[PDB]
């Protein structure tokens, strides 16, 4: 849990590299075909 929160997927394929969680969530939105600005404009709505 600590790795997948502070490092995303990087720790599973090498050294753990820190990255902020709201920014990590933007990466994962890109994986399903959604642009980054969608998350940043609804961060308070998504988090709730």
């Amino acid at each position: 849990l600590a790795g997948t929160i502070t490092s995303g997927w990087t720790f599973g394929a090498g050294p753990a590299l820190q990255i902020p969680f709201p920014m990590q969530m933007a990466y994962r939105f890109n994986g399903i075909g959604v642009t980054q600005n969608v998350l940043y404009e609804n961060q308070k709505l998504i988090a709730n």
Partner: peptide, 27 residues
């Protein structure tokens, strides 16, 4: 790419985005 204003995003910062076409406008 551009999307929206500078108010709904938390953590946005000042900076400059360089325009390649502007230097070509002079000539």
């Amino acid at each position: 790419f551009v999307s929206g204003n500078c108010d709904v995003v938390i953590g946005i910062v000042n900076n400059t985005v360089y325009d390649p076409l502007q230097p070509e406008l002079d000539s």
